[PDB]
Design a protein around this ligand. Sequence first.
Ligand code: CYC
Ligand code: CYC
Ligand code: CYC
Ligand code: CYC
Ligand code: CYC
Ligand code: CYC
Ligand code: CYC
Lengths: 157, 157, 157, 157, 49, 161, 161, 161, 161, 169, 158
Amino acid sequence: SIVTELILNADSESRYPAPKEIQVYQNFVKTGEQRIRIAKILAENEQRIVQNGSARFWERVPNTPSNSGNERKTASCQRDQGWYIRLIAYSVLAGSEKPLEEIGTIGIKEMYNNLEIPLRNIVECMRCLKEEALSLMSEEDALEVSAYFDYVMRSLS
Amino acid sequence: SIVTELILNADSESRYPAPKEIQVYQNFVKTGEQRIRIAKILAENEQRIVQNGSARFWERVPNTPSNSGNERKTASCQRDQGWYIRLIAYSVLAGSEKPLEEIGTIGIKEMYNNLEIPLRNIVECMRCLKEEALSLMSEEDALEVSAYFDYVMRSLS
Amino acid sequence: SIVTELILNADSESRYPAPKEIQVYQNFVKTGEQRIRIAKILAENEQRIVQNGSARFWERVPNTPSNSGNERKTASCQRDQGWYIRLIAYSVLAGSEKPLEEIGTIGIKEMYNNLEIPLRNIVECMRCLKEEALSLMSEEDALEVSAYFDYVMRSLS
Amino acid sequence: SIVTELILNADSESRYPAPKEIQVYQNFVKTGEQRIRIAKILAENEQRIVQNGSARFWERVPNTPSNSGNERKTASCQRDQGWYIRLIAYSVLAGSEKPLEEIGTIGIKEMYNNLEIPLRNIVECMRCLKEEALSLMSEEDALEVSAYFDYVMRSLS
Amino acid sequence: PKEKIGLPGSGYYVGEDFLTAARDPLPGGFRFINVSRYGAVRMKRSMRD
Amino acid sequence: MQDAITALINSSDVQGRYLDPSSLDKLQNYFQSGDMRAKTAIAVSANAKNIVTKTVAKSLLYTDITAPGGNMYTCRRYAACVRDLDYFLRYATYAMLAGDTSILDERILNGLRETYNSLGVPIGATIRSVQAMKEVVTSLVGADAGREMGVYFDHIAAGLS
Amino acid sequence: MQDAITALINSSDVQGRYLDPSSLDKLQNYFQSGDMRAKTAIAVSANAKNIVTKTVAKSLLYTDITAPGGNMYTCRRYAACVRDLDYFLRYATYAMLAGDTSILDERILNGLRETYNSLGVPIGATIRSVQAMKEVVTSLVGADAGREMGVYFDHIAAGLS
Amino acid sequence: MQDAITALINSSDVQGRYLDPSSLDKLQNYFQSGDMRAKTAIAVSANAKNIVTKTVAKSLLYTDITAPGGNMYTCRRYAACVRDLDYFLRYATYAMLAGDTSILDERILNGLRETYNSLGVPIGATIRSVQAMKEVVTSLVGADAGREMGVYFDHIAAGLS
Amino acid sequence: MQDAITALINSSDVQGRYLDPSSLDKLQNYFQSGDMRAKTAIAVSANAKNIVTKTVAKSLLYTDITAPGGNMYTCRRYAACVRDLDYFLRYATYAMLAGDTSILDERILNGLRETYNSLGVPIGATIRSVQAMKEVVTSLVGADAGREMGVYFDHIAAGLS
Amino acid sequence: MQDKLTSVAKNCDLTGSSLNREVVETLKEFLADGEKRVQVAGVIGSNAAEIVKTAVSLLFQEYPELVSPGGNAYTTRRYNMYVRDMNYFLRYCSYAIVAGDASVLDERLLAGLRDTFNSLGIPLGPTARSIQLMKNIVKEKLVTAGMTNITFVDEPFDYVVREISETEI
Amino acid sequence: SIITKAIASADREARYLSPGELRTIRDFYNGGENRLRIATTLIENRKEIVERGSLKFWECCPDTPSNSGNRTYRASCLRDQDWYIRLIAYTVIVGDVEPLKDIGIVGVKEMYESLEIPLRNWVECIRCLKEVTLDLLSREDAAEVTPYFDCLIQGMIP
Ligand SMILES: *[C@H](C)[C@H]1/C(=C/c2[nH]c(/C=C3N=C(/C=C4\NC(=O)C(CC)=C4C)C(C)=C\3CCC(=O)O)c(CCC(=O)O)c2C)NC(=O)[C@@H]1C
Ligand SMILES: *[C@H](C)[C@H]1/C(=C/c2[nH]c(/C=C3N=C(/C=C4\NC(=O)C(CC)=C4C)C(C)=C\3CCC(=O)O)c(CCC(=O)O)c2C)NC(=O)[C@@H]1C
Ligand SMILES: *[C@H](C)[C@H]1/C(=C/c2[nH]c(/C=C3N=C(/C=C4\NC(=O)C(CC)=C4C)C(C)=C\3CCC(=O)O)c(CCC(=O)O)c2C)NC(=O)[C@@H]1C
Ligand SMILES: *[C@H](C)[C@H]1/C(=C/c2[nH]c(/C=C3N=C(/C=C4\NC(=O)C(CC)=C4C)C(C)=C\3CCC(=O)O)c(CCC(=O)O)c2C)NC(=O)[C@@H]1C
Ligand SMILES: *[C@H](C)[C@H]1/C(=C/c2[nH]c(/C=C3N=C(/C=C4\NC(=O)C(CC)=C4C)C(C)=C\3CCC(=O)O)c(CCC(=O)O)c2C)NC(=O)[C@@H]1C
Ligand SMILES: *[C@H](C)[C@H]1/C(=C/c2[nH]c(/C=C3N=C(/C=C4\NC(=O)C(CC)=C4C)C(C)=C\3CCC(=O)O)c(CCC(=O)O)c2C)NC(=O)[C@@H]1C
Ligand SMILES: *[C@H](C)[C@H]1/C(=C/c2[nH]c(/C=C3N=C(/C=C4\NC(=O)C(CC)=C4C)C(C)=C\3CCC(=O)O)c(CCC(=O)O)c2C)NC(=O)[C@@H]1C
């Protein structure tokens, strides 16, 4: 999390946390209720977001391995969408993209190239998922969620 | 300033500011008015802080160059106390200990060892100044001022 | 000892001791009787050196932890003086400041800062001990002892 | 020179010379008169040393470029012998092999390979010169002379 | 002028112990200057001048 | 690197004085503008790739620079030019966030002319590309934030000329 | 390393599941305790040298460990022990601020027993010093924060066992 | 670097001849002065920090250099000036031991002027500081050894201009 | 590393007492033997290559160890064995001059057996060659110095066993 | 050196955007304040000696050690140099106010100023303080004269300080 | 510009700007908006100006490198004509010939002699451009614009 980042930054200089790092830590822990609320919204609406994003994404990309008549491929794509929503919820909880980056971004291109899933299609699906997810967030809540969706999309492309 | 730290943190990764950096920046910008008020309080009350802190410091640590009957040494010590209050005011304005670190903390041990001023005495004087400065502000106003005073004290040890 | 120092110097270039190192070795072993005599002088007169040096030191620096009414602190300071005389005797026997460096110079500042003993007070005490020790030695026998006392004082400052 | 060696050794550690290094310096400067006498001995007897060593070297190694009937080659070999005697005198003066190694030992194999002079023959000539030089000197003075001749021979082999 | 005593490195204080170191006709219409009304600052200026 | 607050603190510190009312007013102005600065930084970050794409399209594409023998010929040089435009955009955003141009002086313009002349990079084409990028950013973030970003874009362009 | 939030995230992630209500309650506990943890970290940072001085005075000084033949004999080994106590204090502060003991396990107690055994460092003396450090910090900061830091001090002592 | 013995050796070596009687006399002079040089080096080593403290107090304290906005203002610049003075003292001691100023030219002076000009360090102030250091050393050691060390201090001062 | 004088000093220092008369007598014995030790070191330095070639000629040559498939077959393995023997001789000379075997245990024998076992170097042949080197050195430097060096040669052989 | 109009006109050709909307808007904004710039310059020129005298007196009040023995303003020689240089600064700041551009300060005031001040040992802290005092006095005089929007008057002085002061953070 | 000239004149004499110079500067700052309008008119109509003037110039001066069948020469000539029209507009913004002189009058003869382009042909082209420009300007605006055309012509004449 961001707390780990502050601790490691302090440890790199072999010193106690500086006032700036303590201020960042306090600002982060001040927003825990909001982060938990956002994660709860993401968890409760995960399947609805997946369904709406899948509908939009299959409208945008008709010839994709998910929409190719294979039920297992469709199920795997929708599970991937759910997993990425879960990772974004983790990142919202942690205050940084570290959980999402460590779980579903490092080596994402290699994994999806091995699976023969075109990365442009996944970027489009992430775009649709982001549009569906941001509609359930208030204006003050959408900054981090949109940033983490953008992080996934940038890692894929 | 905290803004410079955020920008340099983003530049270290060759990326635009992440949502965590943006949130830190926005919080600091919001608190800027309170920071200006605290800096004004420190500026307008500097002399009485120096006088009361010096009285307490000489009561607690009578064996100091500033308490050796030398008018010039006493004047220099009180000028140093005023300078450190000014640096703490700068840091309060900037939202980070960067001004205090750059002007009065890096190389503080070498400078005061060259001047043959005991460092424990300067730590005690900083503690007395912190005690006298914290009494002039609210608890939330004192939250950061105490941190900067502690930063000076830690750098002197 | 100087023997180990010259062996390590020869080994750093992966060659047998050159005539310069051999001459150093010969000049060291030719002064063994003198070094043993000086070490015996230091050992025999250690107590009187400690007492006279401590008297002069307390005259010159009255305000120091070794005379504040604490019997244990006074005993510890006089024990430290005796220990440093012993280390200087070791250095005289070895022909190098290495024994003193390993036993009582590496990390001397950290140890005495943990004990909250001012370092300049210890420098003054070592100066008084040097004055006492060199006054019971020959003019030519005082060179090495003075050098080792200077080494202690320089390591403290 | 050993003085340069001590100073550079102290400088690599960014510290003033240690008491052992000061003792080495004092012992070296103490023996300057004997070094000057030995260097004068080598300078006065250089020609007869070269002549006798050349006679022995040509008796022992007749198949050498010196005595192949080329007057210029013979003169160059004699000049090289004189030059190495001079460098050994320099090293005796400096108390170290640094003059000899920096003027006629570093790159000696490359130079004599480019000149197409067999290195074994040069080693034999150096041995003959060492024997001749040790003849015209007391053993105590010849210690360093033999050491530096051996240094040249090792550098050539 | 005041001598600067006890400067660092002067040996005035031994160790870290600082307590024991102690123990012609005037021109026409000339008007004089009243010291009290002239002020301490201007008087110090004049005397140092 | 210095931002607005650090610059004011430096100016007050060389005089050994607390911030005077004029510098305090400047500091209050910076604090008031901070929200717009953060919004502009977010907007530029969200559209950085599109900004550089439009800049290249409207200032460099289909000219002799991208033709063979031009400095944007071959894929490596094209990618390097795009990377340089990314550098300029990112550091202009940094300078806008800080409210001070010192970052561009210490990290962009120092030795840039010598480096470009050594590599053969066209200085005038770079200046025109920076102008195009400023126009694109202004069209994207509006007139006021566009002018604020254009201050630092113009600082870069003036340093290059 | 790992902190409380990352520990809960990794616990939920190994099951492919969101944060269950118990984990969300624990996360709320950590978020509520964050300000106290920051206060404790600031307090411990301010008096680190004093804490180590008091620990050494009340647990190691004037014992057989500092006499000749003891492991704290000679200034080098005294300084090594002091910096070891400094490491223990700093990394206990790190663990307290993070809310997890993983940093202690991966930075402090990573073969520390083997190193101490090979060097001859007394394990019992070090454990006593850690207990004294915990008591000193508890006196410094208070009761609740004292036991909060004592959790990680006891973790270090248990790891040394 | 190069000391007196190496200087005489090289002077003889460029001509390809043994040391002439004048060079032998100079070498004997250096050998006889070695004892005084060693004593001076010991004295300077013992009181190096005190020498630098007295130098700073004599030439730099309570001037406009240490006042706010000065070059020795802030603690880091004060410590940097002290570090430079320490370098000057140590290398003057080296040169005095060697009997030659070659090490001073090689290690200290070759580029110091341009470095100081780039940094904004006042060269006149540092020359006055070096002269004050020469005075402090000649007061600590004596007249003859003070003059011998002042030779190299003067060489440093001349190389700084 | 540690030599005889340092060993005595450490033995006295572990008890916090000056050197007792027995230690002083041992120190005097070492000082008296130093001249012979230096003479032996000079002789071994002069005849190092001869010692190693005689060792190889009388120990390892014309056996199965140099025939194809042996550990001294190929030029690189022969050179490695010669280099190892040179190391043994040089560090035995270091140990003889120091009067202690600590240098041997620190620079040579620390893990040497494990390394030789990993490479397949025959330990018995190495011990035999060390014995041959001891005999050669004894022949070169005489009886007393021969056994003085043989002490450290036997220490090397025991460390290899 | 260049004034604002010259620099803008040359940049019009340099940048390739010609006379677009942003350039026209900046030109109109600058020309709106031209009369005020001329008025400010007239006020500065009409009261130059008073401004410099007031600022130097306040400087010696805030730095009493400057005029004491060993100070940099010690003796009338150095006092006259102080007054002369402060007049230099005021004159070139008035030039920069008229021109609307800082190139005059760059070319004729700040080029080599740091080298000269390092050579002569002139302290930069008091120099910045004196420039700021002159700026404050000019602002007071402008307020007395009735001027209202005089923000641009701050620009030269502050700029000069930022150019001469050392980097502290 | 006149502002720069006045500042330089004051600086030479180590004096502040005199009241007369300040009055002159104030007058030009007052006229700045009118000059900006005139320059905007020049810029908005530069393409028609260049088109008509180039046709007239090739009619009156046919034996010129641009009128020789080389596409590159003709394109460069048209680019130069547009360049000079824009430079005259910018120097009208400033209000004095200084920017136009600094960019395209000092060394123009040397530049076009190195390029092997006759300067009399350039004078003819600038005359044609001046005539076309005067066709679309009022007499009052022409009084502001024409002297810069004349300055360019004088700087181009061998
Ligand atoms: C007072 C809390 C303690 C103390 C003070 C004391 N100070 C001096 C002299 C100096 N102090 C400074 C300090 C600074 N210079 C900087 O650039 C900064 C960063 C902003 C600081 C804090 C300096 C440079 C000096 C040297 C003199 C000068 O100003 O030029 C003295 C020495 C007085 C003398 O001349 O003997 C003293 C005693 N004394 C105490 O007892 C307190 C613990
Ligand atoms: C006397 C010259 C100065 C002084 C000394 C002082 N020392 C102590 C206590 C200790 N001193 C040591 C010293 C050493 N440990 C080592 O390993 C070595 C190297 C061989 C040395 C010199 C130690 C370990 C202690 C701790 C107690 C113990 O011995 O177990 C004190 C008392 C500390 C206290 O606060 O109780 C004092 C006062 N004090 C002066 O004022 C003199 C300048
Ligand atoms: C065709 C297989 C695919 C495709 C191509 C496409 N390219 C462009 C435009 C450009 N292409 C290049 C290419 C290169 N520049 C180089 O230096 C090299 C290596 C030698 C190459 C291959 C460039 C520079 C351009 C920019 C235009 C220019 O001429 O300067 C376009 C037009 C894009 C636009 O108009 O913006 C297209 C369409 N498009 C497809 O659909 C194919 C898959
Ligand atoms: C003090 C409480 C006790 C003590 C300490 C002691 N330790 C050593 C040596 C080492 N200590 C460590 C520990 C760490 N190093 C790290 O980097 C970290 C993590 C940040 C830890 C925990 C290590 C690795 C060593 C060995 C290497 C080294 O010395 O740097 C010594 C020195 C022992 C020696 O013989 O050299 C000592 C004395 N000893 C006591 O008796 C105290 C009870
Ligand atoms: C002290 C007498 C005066 C003074 C000095 C000062 N120096 C610096 C910084 C640097 N000085 C050097 C110089 C050297 N480089 C070398 O190789 C050698 C020989 C070994 C020397 C002496 C260097 C490299 C620096 C580093 C600059 C940096 O910070 O990177 C400063 C600090 C300057 C700053 O801007 O921070 C100072 C103050 N200044 C005075 O006023 C004294 C008269
Ligand atoms: C013949 C051309 C030259 C010659 C050679 C010579 N060699 C020896 C002895 C040995 N030769 C070897 C050779 C090798 N060992 C290897 O591992 C390899 C790599 C494939 C080679 C080439 C060895 C190991 C020995 C030692 C004896 C043994 O084989 O066990 C001698 C005799 C040496 C002695 O003193 O007994 C000789 C004479 N001599 C010349 O003059 C020719 C130029
Ligand atoms: C010769 C008597 C016997 C022999 C030796 C042999 N050794 C190796 C390889 C190594 N030897 C060492 C030893 C050391 N290296 C050091 O730095 C030191 C301390 C100064 C020592 C003692 C090491 C480390 C190696 C491995 C690395 C290397 O190859 O250099 C070989 C080569 C083996 C191979 O397979 O390459 C040999 C042959 N072998 C015999 O048969 C002799 C009895």
